[PDB]
Ligand binder design. Structure first.
Ligand SMILES: *[C@@H]1O[C@H](CO)[C@@H](O[C@@H]2O[C@H](CO)[C@@H](O[C@@H]3O[C@H](CO)[C@@H](O)[C@H](O)[C@@H]3O)[C@H](O)[C@H]2NC(C)=O)[C@H](O)[C@H]1NC(C)=O
Ligand SMILES: *[C@@H]1O[C@H](CO)[C@@H](O[C@@H]2O[C@H](CO)[C@@H](O[C@@H]3O[C@H](CO)[C@@H](O)[C@H](O)[C@@H]3O)[C@H](O)[C@H]2NC(C)=O)[C@H](O)[C@H]1NC(C)=O
Ligand SMILES: *[C@@H]1O[C@H](CO)[C@@H](O[C@@H]2O[C@H](CO)[C@@H](O[C@@H]3O[C@H](CO)[C@@H](O)[C@H](O)[C@@H]3O)[C@H](O)[C@H]2NC(C)=O)[C@H](O)[C@H]1NC(C)=O
Ligand SMILES: *[C@@H]1O[C@H](CO)[C@@H](O[C@@H]2O[C@H](CO)[C@@H](O[C@@H]3O[C@H](CO)[C@@H](O)[C@H](O)[C@@H]3O)[C@H](O)[C@H]2NC(C)=O)[C@H](O)[C@H]1NC(C)=O
Ligand SMILES: *[C@@H]1O[C@H](CO)[C@@H](O[C@@H]2O[C@H](CO)[C@@H](O[C@@H]3O[C@H](CO)[C@@H](O)[C@H](O)[C@@H]3O)[C@H](O)[C@H]2NC(C)=O)[C@H](O)[C@H]1NC(C)=O
Ligand SMILES: *[C@@H]1O[C@H](CO)[C@@H](O[C@@H]2O[C@H](CO)[C@@H](O[C@@H]3O[C@H](CO)[C@@H](O)[C@H](O)[C@@H]3O)[C@H](O)[C@H]2NC(C)=O)[C@H](O)[C@H]1NC(C)=O
Ligand SMILES: *[C@@H]1O[C@H](CO)[C@@H](O[C@@H]2O[C@H](CO)[C@@H](O[C@@H]3O[C@H](CO)[C@@H](O)[C@H](O)[C@@H]3O)[C@H](O)[C@H]2NC(C)=O)[C@H](O)[C@H]1NC(C)=O
Ligand SMILES: *[C@@H]1O[C@H](CO)[C@@H](O[C@@H]2O[C@H](CO)[C@@H](O)[C@H](O)[C@H]2NC(C)=O)[C@H](O)[C@H]1NC(C)=O
Ligand SMILES: *[C@@H]1O[C@H](CO)[C@@H](O[C@@H]2O[C@H](CO)[C@@H](O)[C@H](O)[C@H]2NC(C)=O)[C@H](O)[C@H]1NC(C)=O
Ligand SMILES: *[C@@H]1O[C@H](CO)[C@@H](O[C@@H]2O[C@H](CO)[C@@H](O)[C@H](O)[C@H]2NC(C)=O)[C@H](O)[C@H]1NC(C)=O
Ligand SMILES: *[C@@H]1O[C@H](CO)[C@@H](O[C@@H]2O[C@H](CO)[C@@H](O)[C@H](O)[C@H]2NC(C)=O)[C@H](O)[C@H]1NC(C)=O
Ligand SMILES: *[C@@H]1O[C@H](CO)[C@@H](O[C@@H]2O[C@H](CO)[C@@H](O)[C@H](O)[C@H]2NC(C)=O)[C@H](O)[C@H]1NC(C)=O
Ligand SMILES: *[C@@H]1O[C@H](CO)[C@@H](O[C@@H]2O[C@H](CO)[C@@H](O)[C@H](O)[C@H]2NC(C)=O)[C@H](O)[C@H]1NC(C)=O
Ligand SMILES: *[C@@H]1O[C@H](CO)[C@@H](O[C@@H]2O[C@H](CO)[C@@H](O)[C@H](O)[C@H]2NC(C)=O)[C@H](O)[C@H]1NC(C)=O
Ligand SMILES: *[C@@H]1O[C@H](CO)[C@@H](O[C@@H]2O[C@H](CO)[C@@H](O)[C@H](O)[C@H]2NC(C)=O)[C@H](O)[C@H]1NC(C)=O
Ligand SMILES: *[C@@H]1O[C@H](CO)[C@@H](O[C@@H]2O[C@H](CO)[C@@H](O)[C@H](O)[C@H]2NC(C)=O)[C@H](O)[C@H]1NC(C)=O
Ligand SMILES: *[C@@H]1O[C@H](CO)[C@@H](O)[C@H](O)[C@H]1NC(C)=O
Ligand SMILES: *[C@@H]1O[C@H](CO)[C@@H](O)[C@H](O)[C@H]1NC(C)=O
Ligand SMILES: *[C@@H]1O[C@H](CO)[C@@H](O)[C@H](O)[C@H]1NC(C)=O
Ligand SMILES: *[C@@H]1O[C@H](CO)[C@@H](O)[C@H](O)[C@H]1NC(C)=O
Ligand SMILES: *[C@@H]1O[C@H](CO)[C@@H](O)[C@H](O)[C@H]1NC(C)=O
Ligand SMILES: *[C@@H]1O[C@H](CO)[C@@H](O)[C@H](O)[C@H]1NC(C)=O
Ligand SMILES: *[C@@H]1O[C@H](CO)[C@@H](O)[C@H](O)[C@H]1NC(C)=O
Lengths: 438, 132, 132, 132, 53
């Protein structure tokens, strides 16, 4: 007869959420974080299979709110720009006649309170017409002042995305499938496990995904519900698509001592190649990759349907255009130049017009706003487009797709789908032929 | 042969029992190594939860007179209603995950007798053997 | 019969010993399950103090060669000055609370020999039995 | 004779072994007893680190089938390459600090066999003695 | 015309009239597992072995 035998160290686990913590090397917000191991360990697990589900992966939720928390903490100790909310006296800026630049900035002046709380000083600064609005030269207002206060980001702190690793506490395991195929959820024939995750950069962007990871095999299409056009579609590329964006303005920073003590960085003068900031895209590369994407689409909609690509529905600029950070500066680009195509039934280069804003609102959050300091000198950078955030638009053939975003949990999820966290249960029992003596 | 953490997870329960310690070590792990700040109380909380997580079950093994754990026998007989399979149908043809899939239904029920029967009776008895 | 947490508190020490485990479990309990905030570091502090509170005495039982606790014998004889009563006057006619009322006077004194005598001598001895 | 905490630190390893418990007690110590504030999370952190510091190694002694610690034997033979000295050259003529000075070189190496060999083999074996 | 010197560098805060600045003897302690070592050697070069610890 068999008896109850007690076992400990049993290799079993249940899907469970706990509090994850970071790790990264030894700028943005990361210093108070445990350095990574010089030899991150892993182990493929043979005969071990189980389901993943990226759409209920609470790792995303934590990461999201943690990044937000970091953001706020990095701003509290910086200078508040409360006394900037004043009536502005502004005029057009006579760019090289006649007018290709459309101005876009105003030579605003105003009676400003200085360190000598008492006698004020008439000063001036160049502002983008996206930041200011006419009251009622003419009178203008900082747009934020009708919604909330605004804080100047410190000139020392940066916004450069840094690779972050996530680790689980003892008793919890980081599981990672290596299956090159994945529908977004279901069993994985090839499952491994790791100490911690790979370095993920906290890149904030809409519409287009930047500097992410690459997919293997073919282009990956992932969606909570492909047939439901109330949902959206994640597209992961196989090959990095280069994009090179430039701001050809060797401008200065006429910092103004609007104390007491604390200093404000206003916009000095704009000189150099007065052209609109824009992005350069390899056209043939875009066409080629887009085609590869359409192949996938064909595979989930039929071998006799029509695929069209267009821009967004419009509205809030933050959603309408492609937003991203380069070197502290915030760009808004008209991606109509990319998302304008079509496919049937079965250099060259592209220039994307961009705009610059200085007053921005993070993560759709209202109640506060952050002032970007102007960055001195010409700003230009390059990155890898590694995926798309697409939405699905008389429904028997032609379908139209367009870029979206808004919810930045989407961005984190586009990477964390490779991971899941489980809770180990060391204690188990089993029937064994054994009668225990004294 | 050293396999690695959970290296035997994809094997039969008999096979897996070979290397329970390789797992045991990292069940508590250890090491790890402007105030507050994000992570400031998260590494705190997590590292705490690890300790609790561990001891909560370790104490049960303390109560279930074994202590010298990973494996030990009892004087509680197995009730046939708790998944009636043969040893070769169990130990030589089933993983630990597959095992739990079934037996998990009677977890607290089995714990009842483990928490008690023997622990109660093994003692008293001894106290009586100490009479002389 | 399951009585409940401290269910035997109002009985003789002999009777109470029947169900020490029912209490033992909840001596550490476990489970439980804008930053800071009131309670934010209080649940923290309390849950910590529980762990320390437990182990501080558990280690003593580790030192006092038993480990398999709730009950164990020693090789230290009872000094008659420590409340000279008969077993029936003690075990069959006194609660644990009433017991402490008296014996608490010699707590550290008794701990001295428990902390030592046997722990010292049981060993060496064994080391010598291992000679052959 | 009570010496005090680390009172035998300046003696031979043989002599020092007499009073290991006097040290053992204070390895975890216990007691100790506007928000945040300096010290507010430092006493916190420190007291935590003490608990972890302790258990991290205590678990190893749990794995190394002894538990009844301070001293216990194994079934692992000593490799002569690990500082080849005689017992009188070691135990009767060397402090623990001096000992570590040398043997520390093979710490993890020795731990390998302690973590395993016996722990693996002592068991199975027993399981087989339980056949009848 | 005169100016408070601090105003060209930063803001300035008034110390509370109740709080004092009297130096108070502070003792430092290490957590369990750590020891506070103290040499009693009346001689010391700033570093090196101490005969009397
Ligand atoms: C801050 O800049 C504002 C303009 O942005 C200056 O406003 C000027 O303020 C004075 C006092 O309110 C106005 O002067 C008065 O005007 C009336 C009519 O012209 C005249 O009857 C009075 O004798 C007196 O001069 C002035 O018109 C107004 N300017 C405008 C454009 O409205 C203000 O002076 C500036 N402060 C500093 C310190 O420069
Ligand atoms: C933008 O508005 C600012 C005022 O808010 C204008 O500032 C003016 O800038 C010029 C060039 O720096 C200054 O002119 C120079 O002044 C000195 C002394 O008067 C003179 O020696 C030079 O020959 C030259 O004229 C001017 O004084 C300054 N005004 C003030 C109030 O400081 C600037 O002109 C505006 N830009 C646009 C396009 O209108
Ligand atoms: C993917 O999501 C889509 C939409 O979010 C789900 O589509 C829903 O499918 C059901 C079944 O075809 C439709 O229900 C039927 O609707 C008609 C009219 O409302 C009603 O007469 C029937 O009694 C029935 O409820 C539902 O309307 C349709 N929703 C929409 C937006 O078209 C689909 O079920 C989702 N798949 C997954 C696996 O959940
Ligand atoms: C994306 O590109 C499409 C064209 O491919 C742009 O379509 C434009 O969308 C707006 C909003 O639906 C239309 O404006 C409305 O037009 C009516 C009539 O002209 C007018 O009564 C309204 O006051 C309003 O302006 C506009 O006509 C339509 N253009 C065409 C060619 O149909 C859309 O603006 C583009 N989005 C981005 C962000 O540029
Ligand atoms: C992963 O699961 C596979 C089955 O899907 C397990 O395969 C087993 O692997 C071992 C090693 O290759 C085979 O054992 C060898 O078999 C031969 C003939 O029976 C015997 O001569 C050797 O002494 C040895 O036992 C075993 O037959 C093979 N099983 C089958 C179905 O092919 C593997 O063990 C699994 N790994 C885990 C960790 O459980
Ligand atoms: C609470 O204290 C009361 C006394 O104040 C304890 O009463 C005892 O209760 C038990 C159960 O009713 C009685 O035991 C039974 O007695 C009869 C005759 O002696 C015997 O035939 C049965 O086998 C059984 O032992 C006991 O006599 C009674 N004591 C007295 C003084 O009446 C009760 O045990 C206390 N509870 C706690 C948890 O200690
Ligand atoms: C500190 O180190 C000193 C040596 O530097 C150790 O000295 C030893 O002290 C004991 C006690 O005074 C001596 O033991 C006695 O020796 C006599 C003759 O051998 C014997 O008749 C007694 O039964 C007893 O053993 C010992 O000889 C002396 N050693 C020397 C070199 O003089 C002392 O033990 C050290 N303390 C620590 C804690 O290790
Ligand atoms: C600043 O220049 C802009 C053009 O760059 C002028 O814009 C005109 O503004 C009025 C009022 O909104 C409109 O009636 C005109 O149709 C606008 N013109 C165009 C080209 O859109 C504005 O008048 C200029 N201000 C100054 C003082 O001359
Ligand atoms: C706060 O100011 C904003 C502009 O900075 C106002 O926004 C306008 O809101 C109405 C209603 O949604 C729209 O018709 C306008 O087009 C918006 N303007 C822009 C710039 O987007 C808003 O009305 C202001 N609130 C207060 C109470 O006046
Ligand atoms: C763009 O992504 C490509 C991967 O497709 C990256 O390629 C790496 O490029 C460097 C420089 O040539 C090589 O050292 C690496 O070995 C390349 N990787 C592979 C996979 O071939 C490139 O680094 C990416 N750029 C950005 C800015 O991240
Ligand atoms: C769409 O038609 C293509 C052929 O034009 C089909 O292609 C097959 O796809 C599967 C999956 O990749 C392969 O197993 C076959 O070998 C492919 N055939 C050939 C000719 O390459 C695809 O099955 C079609 N889809 C529909 C729904 O019928
Ligand atoms: C959408 O892109 C197409 C090219 O893919 C653009 O097509 C141009 O359309 C105009 C109007 O019919 C013609 O004058 C051009 O010759 C067309 N170009 C070519 C390549 O055929 C169209 O302009 C684009 N729309 C957007 C808003 O940029
Ligand atoms: C094994 O445990 C089962 C419950 O898991 C016990 O089942 C009882 O069996 C008897 C006989 O069929 C019935 O009278 C009871 O009603 C059953 N209980 C329930 C919960 O269904 C069985 O008694 C147990 N065997 C041992 C030896 O205790
Ligand atoms: C029992 O402990 C008591 C102290 O609790 C010891 O009492 C000593 O007894 C002798 C004889 O009466 C006196 O010389 C001492 O002065 C007493 N000590 C004190 C503290 O009063 C007694 O020795 C102990 N018995 C055992 C066997 O050790
Ligand atoms: C004792 O351990 C040493 C290593 O610390 C072992 O050394 C090996 O000895 C043999 C014979 O000289 C050599 O072939 C190996 O290359 C040595 N290893 C190294 C690391 O130098 C020795 O085998 C061990 N003895 C026991 C019984 O295991
Ligand atoms: C801030 O004010 C201080 C005086 O309160 C200025 O200090 C002078 O600095 C120069 C350069 O080091 C020295 O030549 C003077 O002797 C300093 N004065 C004293 C009182 O030490 C400093 O220049 C001021 N900064 C600003 C921007 O004006
Ligand atoms: C993209 O290339 C495809 C063929 O691969 C072609 O059908 C389409 O016209 C191309 N687009 C561009 C802009 O040339
Ligand atoms: C138990 O295994 C034997 C063979 O060893 C088999 O005859 C019997 O069917 C097995 N049990 C079950 C419930 O079938
Ligand atoms: C365990 O029982 C639950 C109902 O209590 C049931 O949902 C599940 O299927 C059961 N598992 C087994 C193996 O029968
Ligand atoms: C011990 O009990 C006996 C009866 O069992 C009694 O004669 C004696 O008085 C008791 N002890 C005390 C101190 O009285
Ligand atoms: C214990 O002794 C203390 C004095 O040390 C005294 O106050 C108390 O009454 C004593 N208890 C006993 C039972 O005598
Ligand atoms: C071991 O000690 C003996 C004396 O007991 C000595 O003869 C021999 O030299 C010692 N070992 C070493 C390595 O010398
Ligand atoms: C231990 O070996 C290290 C090199 O691995 C060396 O630096 C040190 O001297 C060694 N100690 C012994 C006692 O030889």
């Amino acid at each position: 007869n068999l008896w109850v035998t007690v076992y400990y160290g049993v290799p079993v686990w249940k899907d469970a959420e706990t509090t994850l913590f970071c790790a990264s090397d030894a700028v943005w917000a990361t210093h108070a974080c445990v350095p990574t191991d010089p030899n991150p360990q892993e182990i493929h697990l043979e005969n071990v299979t189980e389901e993943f589900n990226m759409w209920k992966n609470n790792m995303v939720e934590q990461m999201h709110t943690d990044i937000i928390s970091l953001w706020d903490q990095s701003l509290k100790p910086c200078v508040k720009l409360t006394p900037l909310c004043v009536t502005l006296q502004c005029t057009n800026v006579t760019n090289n006649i006649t007018d290709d630049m459309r101005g876009e900035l105003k030579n605003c002046s105003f009676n400003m309170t200085t360190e000598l709380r008492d006698k004020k000083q008439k000063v001036y600064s160049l502002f983008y017409r996206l930041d200011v609005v006419q009251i009622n030269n003419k009178e203008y207002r900082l747009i934020n002042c009708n919604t909330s206060a605004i804080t100047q980001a410190c000139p020392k702190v940066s916004f450069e995305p840094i690779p972050i690793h996530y680790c689980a506490p003892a008793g919890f395991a980081i599981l990672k499938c290596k299956d090159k195929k994945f529908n977004g959820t279901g069993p994985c024939p090839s499952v491994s496990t790791v100490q911690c995750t790979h370095g993920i950069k906290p890149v904030v962007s809409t519409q287009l995904l930047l500097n992410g990871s690459l997919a293997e095999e073919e282009v990956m299409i992932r969606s909570e519900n492909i047939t439901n056009n109330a949902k959206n579609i994640l597209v992961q590329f196989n090959t990095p698509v280069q994009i090179n964006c430039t701001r050809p303005n060797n401008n200065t920073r006429k910092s103004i001592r609007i104390g007491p003590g604390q200093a404000f960085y206003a916009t000095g003068d704009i000189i150099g190649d007065i052209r609109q900031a824009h992005c350069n895209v390899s056209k043939a590369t875009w066409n080629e990759t887009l085609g590869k994407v359409v192949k996938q689409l064909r595979k989930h909609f039929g071998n006799n349907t029509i695929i069209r690509f267009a821009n967004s529905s419009g509205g809030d600029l933050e959603v309408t255009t492609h937003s991203f950070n380069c070197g502290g500066e915030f760009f808004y680009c008209n991606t109509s130049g990319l998302f304008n195509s079509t496919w049937i039934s079965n250099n060259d280069s592209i220039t994307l017009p961009c705009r610059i804003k200085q007053i921005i609102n993070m993560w759709q959050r209202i109640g506060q706003a952050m002032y970007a300091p102007p960055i001195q000198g010409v700003i230009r950078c390059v990155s890898n487009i590694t995926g798309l955030i697409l939405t699905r638009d008389t429904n028997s053939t032609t379908e139209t797709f367009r870029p979206g975003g808004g919810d930045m949990r989407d961005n984190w999820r586009s990477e964390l789908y490779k991971y899941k966290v489980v809770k180990i249960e060391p204690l188990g029992v089993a029937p064994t032929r054994c009668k225990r003596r004294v | 042969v050293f396999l690695g953490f959970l290296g035997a997870a994809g094997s039969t329960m008999g096979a897996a029992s070979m290397t329970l310690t390789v797992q045991a070590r990292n069940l508590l792990s250890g090491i790890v190594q402007l105030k507050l700040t994000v992570w400031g109380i998260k590494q705190l909380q997590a590292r705490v939860l690890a300790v609790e997580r561990y001891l909560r079950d370790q104490q049960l093994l303390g109560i279930w007179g074994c202590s010298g754990k990973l494996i030990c026998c009892t004087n509680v007989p197995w009730n046939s209603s708790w998944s009636n399979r043969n040893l070769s149908e169990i130990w030589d043809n089933m993983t630990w995950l597959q095992w739990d899939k079934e037996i998990s239904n009677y977890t607290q029920i089995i714990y009842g007798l483990l928490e008690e029967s023997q622990n109660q009776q093994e003692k008293n008895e001894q106290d009586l053997l100490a009479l002389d």
